[PDB]
């Protein structure tokens, strides 16, 4: 039963290594969206700052 | 006449110009690079609220140098402009006499920008003229 | 002005002249029979690398680069820059009488943190 239970630790470890690459690409997307929002906002700002 | 001049060397060669034309002396810390600069200038620094150019003296005169050994900026002062000159070690203030002063500069590269040559204590201290040196660097 | 940096050196860009600020890909940029161009909105824009037109040593390797499109006369060229610092209303001072020959800068300036920043001339780069 410690065989079956310790093998079920490898089920949790390989579930967390799947979730790590998952969340990492979701966070690399939140970096992309924020850095594009930053460049977009600085265009509105630079085009607004000459429009009277 | 008893002129008091600022004494300093470049690659073991002695030079000097008057104290009348000095603003201060500093150690080179972060000289801002100016793109497309002529070969004899390092860049610009802010001193005493003014934007001072830092020229490299030896590249105006036509004499040898080392640019990791040179680390002293001597800031000058004319009516027209204030300019810093990057060189090696500095000595300090020296009162010179006309009796040990010769006017032979026939063989010198910067010899029409030199007021003379001071033959004091076995050294060959060449006396410069700030004005005519500054007229060459201006564009 | 829009303060931009290359080599961590402040270069100011006149806001009034601008047209957009765009992050472009390295795959897109191409040469026809002259200097670098980029096809943007199906139009062809003559892109320039700030550090090249100023003749200063800079990074070797390609990356996705930030470009500022500046307008001049009836046209507009691209200026590629490294990082974007931040806008401010600055005070234009003289470039200096040892630098008279340089056509790319109209005037130096002292920023609020005491940093020196040169101001680019919009018609000085071709």
Describe the secondary structure blueprint for this structure:
This is part of a larger assembly, with chains A (52 residues), B (139 residues) and C (126 residues).
Chain A: H1 2-48
Chain B: E1 3-10, E2 13-18, E3 22-27, E4 41-47, E5 50-55, H1 58-61, E6 72-76, E7 84-87, E8 90-96, E9 101-102, E10 114-118, E11 125-128, H2 130-137
Parallel strand pairs in B: 2-11, 5-7
Antiparallel strand pairs in B: 1-2, 1-8, 3-6, 4-5, 6-7, 9-10, 10-11
Chain C: E1 2-6, E2 9-13, E3 18-24, E4 38-40, E5 43-45, E6 47-49, H1 50-53, E7 65-72, E8 75-81, E9 83-84, E10 105-107, E11 118-120
Parallel strand pairs in C: 2-11, 6-8
Antiparallel strand pairs in C: 1-2, 1-9, 3-7, 4-5, 7-8, 10-11
PDB class: signaling protein
Keywords: bacterial chemotaxis, core-signaling unit, adaptor protein, histidine kinase, chemoreceptor, signaling protein
Entry title: Cryo-electron Tomography and All-atom Molecular Dynamics Simulations Reveal a Novel Kinase Conformational Switch in Bacterial Chemotaxis Signaling
Short description:
The structure is cut from a larger assembly and holds chains A (52 residues), B (139 residues) and C (126 residues). In chain A, 90% of the residues lie in helices and 0% in strands.
How much strand of chain C?
35-45%
Shape of chain C: globular
Radius of gyration of chain A: 23 Å
Number of strands of chain C: 11
Q: What is the chains' assembly state?
A: part of a larger assembly
- DSSP, total strands of chain A: 0
Q: Name the largest protein-protein interface in this structure.
A: B-C, 18 and 20 residues
Strand content of chain A: under 5%
PDB class: signaling protein
Keywords: bacterial chemotaxis, core-signaling unit, adaptor protein, histidine kinase, chemoreceptor, signaling protein
Entry title: Cryo-electron Tomography and All-atom Molecular Dynamics Simulations Reveal a Novel Kinase Conformational Switch in Bacterial Chemotaxis Signaling
Chain A: Methyl-accepting chemotaxis protein 2
Structure description:
This is part of a larger assembly, with chains A (52 residues), B (139 residues) and C (126 residues). With 52 residues, chain A is mainly alpha-helical. Chain A is built from 1 helix and no strands. The longest helix of chain A has 47 residues, at 2-48. Chain B is mainly beta and 139 residues long. Chain C has 126 residues and is mainly β. Chains in contact: A-C, B-C. Chain B binds chain C through residues 32-38, 41, 44, 46, 51, 53, 55, 81, 83, 137-139, and chain C through 9, 54-56, 93, 95-102, 104-105, 108, 110, 114, 116, 118. The PDB classes it as signaling protein. Keywords: bacterial chemotaxis, adaptor protein. The entry is titled "Cryo-electron Tomography and All-atom Molecular Dynamics Simulations Reveal a Novel Kinase Conformational Switch in Bacterial Chemotaxis Signaling".
